[PDB]
């Protein structure tokens, strides 16, 4: 269920490099996380994102 949430930068203005499961690509893609809020489709690495969502 978390694997189908959109990538959410959230309102904060940091530039953390994160990963989210993109249901269109059928795999994990990078995105920029602001550092607060967003959602749980938000992983530190490609490998862990794929274990949770692949």
């Amino acid at each position: 269920e978390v694997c189908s949430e959109q990538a959410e930068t959230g309102p904060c203005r940091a530039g953390f490099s994160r990963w989210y499961f993109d249901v269109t690509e059928g795999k994990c893609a990078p995105f920029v996380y602001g550092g607060c809020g967003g959602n749980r489709n938000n992983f530190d690495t490609e490998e862990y994102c794929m274990a949770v969502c692949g």
Binding site: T9, P11, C12, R13, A14, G15, F16, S17, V32, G34, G35, C36
Partner: protein, 224 residues
């Protein structure tokens, strides 16, 4: 920074960056050993780089110094974003020269309507990703709390103020967080949050540094 301009080299010697693998936030050097940033920029380990103009094209006279101490405001609130300010103590003193220099603490809050200088290596697009290598600048007015609260109903704490243009088009953005807002030579603000970047009726929300001047002095003092 959206709708800004590449800063003159290096007319922003107090600008710093926070790094962990990559650049993730901005900051401001306020003494030889202390940097101010945002609390949502917290990580366990941070490298601070000073005197950078282009962050990927190094010119020899930038300083890389690890954080010895990384101290969030103790009333920082993850959910409301209240007290979004953090201090970093440099593991060794930065060398003051014409590339690396401090910015003064504020002696009074900014008047609404005053023009301020915001800076950072954040995203230069309101939609899509264009992360610049070169440091960007924006001149923008401090807005009234009326304008600020009208843009963000129910969300503006006493620690927050808006700087920007309600029309949209000009704003800080992702990777700018922690960076400085300077009005008339004093640090007034820390880049914080906003709804998108440079969107209509959605100005940038910044932490009021003036509210923390005693907490910053006490924290500097307690950590010698």
């Amino acid at each position: 920074i959206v709708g800004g301009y590449t800063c003159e080299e290096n007319s922003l010697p107090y600008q710093v960056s926070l790094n962990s693998g990559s650049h993730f936030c901005g900051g401001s050097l306020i003494s030889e050993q202390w940097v101010v940033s945002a609390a949502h920029c917290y990580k366990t380990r941070i490298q601070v780089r000073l005197g950078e103009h282009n962050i990927k094209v190094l010119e020899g006279n930038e300083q890389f110094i690890n954080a010895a101490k990384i101290i969030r405001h103790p009333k920082y609130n993850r959910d409301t974003l209240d007290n979004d300010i953090m201090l970093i103590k440099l593991s060794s003193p930065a060398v003051i020269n014409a590339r690396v220099s401090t910015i003064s603490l504020p002696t009074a809050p900014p008047a609404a309507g005053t023009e301020c200088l915001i800076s950072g290596w954040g995203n230069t697009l309101s939609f899509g990703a264009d992360y610049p290598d070169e440091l960007k600048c924006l001149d923008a007015p401090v807005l009234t709390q009326a304008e600020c609260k009208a843009s963000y109903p129910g969300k503006i704490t006493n620690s927050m103020f808006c700087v920007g243009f309600l029309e949209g088009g000009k704003d800080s953005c992702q990777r700018d967080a922690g960076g400085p807002v300077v009005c008339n030579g004093q640090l007034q603000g820390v880049v914080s949050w906003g709804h998108g970047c440079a969107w209509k009726n959605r100005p940038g929300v910044y932490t009021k540094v003036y509210n923390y001047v005693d907490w910053i002095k006490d924290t500097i003092a307690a950590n010698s």
